Amino acid sequence: MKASRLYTLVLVLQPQRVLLGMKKRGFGAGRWNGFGGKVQEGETIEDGARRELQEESGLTVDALHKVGQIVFEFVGEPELMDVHVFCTDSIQGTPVESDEMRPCWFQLDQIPFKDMWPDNSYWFPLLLQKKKFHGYFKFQGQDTILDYTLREVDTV
Ligand SMILES: Nc1[nH]c(=O)nc2c1ncn2[C@H]1C[C@H](O)[C@@H](COP(=O)(O)OP(=O)(O)OP(=O)(O)O)O1
Ligand code: NA
Ligand code: NA
């Protein structure tokens, strides 16, 4: 089994809308995603999620709720991405566009799945139902899933 690197993903999910960030630069530009990044040495995963949310969007939160964990495998890449997925409780602030990310709220009847990572179509419905999940997705490139597993869990 490959080594895995820890990442976070934060979904700012309100009753009728979700905040996503559009990757502005680099390959993959134009995809909407939650906020997050690599966990750093010495921080808890949740603190890394809070930190990345703030660094990427400007938003702070007092607490995050862990809602899922998803492992991504990419053909041609040695490491798995172990993504710990959190949802926000009560955000502070306004989201800020950076050179790398444009934030945007989407109503929950307008979730832009076709412009999100393909896996999101599978697990974000569970998140919306207040279900917790574990997933794994193996991608060839950015668009093609070759294998995946997904399970609702009681405890992430
Ligand atoms: N298939 C996928 N589905 C998804 O919903 N989010 C994914 C994803 N693949 C990657 N991500 C998320 C996980 C994490 O939030 C982010 C990847 O982390 P990054 O490479 O952005 O980390 P960092 O911002 O720490 O790296 P640097 O910007 O180089 O420092 O993209
Ligand atoms: Na990031
Ligand atoms: Na980072």
Side-chain angles (χ1 to χ4, degrees):
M1 161 164 279
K2 288 172 165 172
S4 74
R5 185 172 301 279
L6 276 173
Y7 297 78
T8 58
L9 182 65
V10 178
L11 284 307
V12 177
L13 179 60
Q14 293 191 330
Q16 64 294 94
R17 62 178 186 170
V18 62
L19 184 71
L20 296 169
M22 202 195 71
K23 185 166 295 178
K24 288 174 63 179
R25 293 195 306 200
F27 167 77
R31 183 160 284 184
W32 295 97
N33 191 221
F35 303 100
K38 291 170 188 177
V39 178
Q40 293 176 7
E41 176 195 352
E43 68 185 357
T44 66
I45 296 176
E46 184 193 341
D47 283 350
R50 289 177 57 239
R51 175 186 53 71
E52 289 283 340
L53 177 66
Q54 190 280 327
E55 287 179 8
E56 185 169 355
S57 78
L59 294 174
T60 58
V61 293
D62 282 314
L64 291 178
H65 178 53
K66 191 173 188 180
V67 298
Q69 189 180 347
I70 309 166
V71 174
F72 297 106
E73 182 165 3
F74 287 88
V75 171
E77 301 191 37
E79 293 176 0
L80 301 171
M81 304 175 63
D82 181 19
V83 182
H84 293 250
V85 187
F86 296 83
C87 281
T88 52
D89 168 33
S90 69
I91 64 174
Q92 294 103 225
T94 54
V96 178
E97 177 167 353
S98 69
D99 293 323
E100 294 187 24
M101 183 286 292
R102 177 173 301 102
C104 184
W105 289 104
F106 291 86
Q107 293 290 94
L108 291 177
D109 61 359
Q110 292 286 275
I111 301 162
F113 288 112
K114 78 188 204 173
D115 284 322
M116 292 162 80
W117 278 97
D119 49 281
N120 288 200
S121 290
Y122 297 87
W123 58 260
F124 188 73
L126 293 173
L127 189 150
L128 295 174
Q129 297 182 305
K130 312 310 166 54
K131 298 171 181 169
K132 295 180 181 67
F133 55 88
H134 283 174
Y136 163 79
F137 295 80
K138 179 175 177 173
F139 276 87
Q140 174 73 68
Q142 305 236 305
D143 298 327
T144 302
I145 294 163
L146 299 185
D147 186 23
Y148 74 98
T149 64
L150 182 64
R151 58 179 188 274
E152 182 178 356
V153 298
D154 285 311
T155 298
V156 185

